[PDB]
Structure 1
Amino acid sequence: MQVILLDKVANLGSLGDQVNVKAGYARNFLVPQGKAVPATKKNIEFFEARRAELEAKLAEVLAAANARAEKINALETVTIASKAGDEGKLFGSIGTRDIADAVTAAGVEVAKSEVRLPNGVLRTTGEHEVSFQVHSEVFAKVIVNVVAE
């Protein structure tokens, strides 16, 4: 039987994989408990609309981000300034927060979230790269040069 599934199910139930399976678990109980559906010649392509709907759409719209991580990469150096101590040591901190507005006005609008860093920055001045979480994979590669004043 073709009855298509939903959740895991022992062995398989790979969310959406058609089957050759006995009428028992199905109809009898399984299906009768939110867990699969009659894999009619209708349903069998109902979810194919979903596989072919959710895909090209919301999926590749990760590229409707990818390049905003490249918009970023167009300007590979932005400056933020906030008092230093002679020889580097700047009193307060470069803030996960501040670094928002600091690129909110430099094109790539952003909010405090995104912004992945390495250590509870900042304190030391000069050169600092930064990887971002704009989505999943291809991070950014931004650098910020901190002037004193």
Structure 2
Amino acid sequence: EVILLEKVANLGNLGDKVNIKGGYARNFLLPQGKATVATAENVAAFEARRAELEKAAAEKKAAAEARAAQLSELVVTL
């Protein structure tokens, strides 16, 4: 009932329509820009933007290549 927009969910995919609970669509996914309710009004707009899904979702895992190298330094003085 929703199109996903992130591939790091524990039971999610790239852009697959999944039918989920109403609270999970309502309260978490839609206010955080990671899913949108699968409506039958703009479906021909999704197929003319399928090459937009590759760039940011490849760059996200590519930015964590050098992001995790500064978290495990253990230089925080309590």
TM-score, normalising length from structure 1? 0.30
Q: What percent of counterpart residues are identical?
A: 62
In 2 relative to 1, CA 7–29 (structure 1 residues): closer, same or farther, beyond 3 Å? same
Counterpart of 1:50? 49
Structure 1 residue 43: Cα displacement? 3.8
For residue 11 of structure 1, what is the amino acid of its counterpart? L
Supply the distance in 2 between the matched residues of 1:49 and 1:24 (Cα, whole angstroms).
30
Letter in 2 for 1:17: D
Residue 35 of structure 2 is matched in structure 1 by 36
Measured in 2, the distance between the counterparts of 1:20 and 1:44 equals: 17
Q: 1:43 to 1:22 in 2, by over 3 A?
A: farther
The alpha carbon displacement at 1:5 in A equals 0.9
CA shift, 1:15, in A, is: 1.5
**Residues 25 and 31 of structure 1: is their aligned pair in 2 closer, same or farther, counting only changes over 3 Å?**
same
Instruction: Say which structure, 1 or 2, has more relative contact order (CA 8 Å, 6+ apart).
Output: 2
For the pair shown, which has the larger CA radius of gyration, 1 or 2?
Answer: 1
Aligned equivalent of 2:11: 11
User: Which amino acid is the alignment partner of residue 49 of structure 2?
Assistant: R
Give the gaps of 5 or more residues in structure 2: 52-78
- Root-mean-square deviation (CA), in Å? 1.7
Q: Tell me how far 1:34 sits from its aligned partner.
A: 1.1
Alignment map for 1:100-139 (pairs within 5 Å): none
Distance 2:20 2:43 in 1: 15
Cα shift at 1:22: 1.3
What is the identity, as a one-letter code, of the residue corresponding to 1:38?
Answer: V
Distance 1:33 1:21, change over 3 A: same
**Residue 7 to residue 27, structure 1, CA distance change in 2 (3 Å):** same
Q: Do the aligned partners of residues 33 and 44 (structure 1) sit closer, same or farther apart at CA in structure 2, a change above 3 Å counting? A: same
For residues 41-63 of structure 1, the C-alpha deviation after alignment (integer angstroms, 9 at most, x for no partner) is: 12444212323xx4xxxxxxxxx
Gaps of 5+ in 1: 55-149
Instruction: Report the secondary structure of 1:49's partner residue.
Output: coil
Instruction: Count how many residue pairs are aligned between Structure 1 and Structure 2.
Output: 50
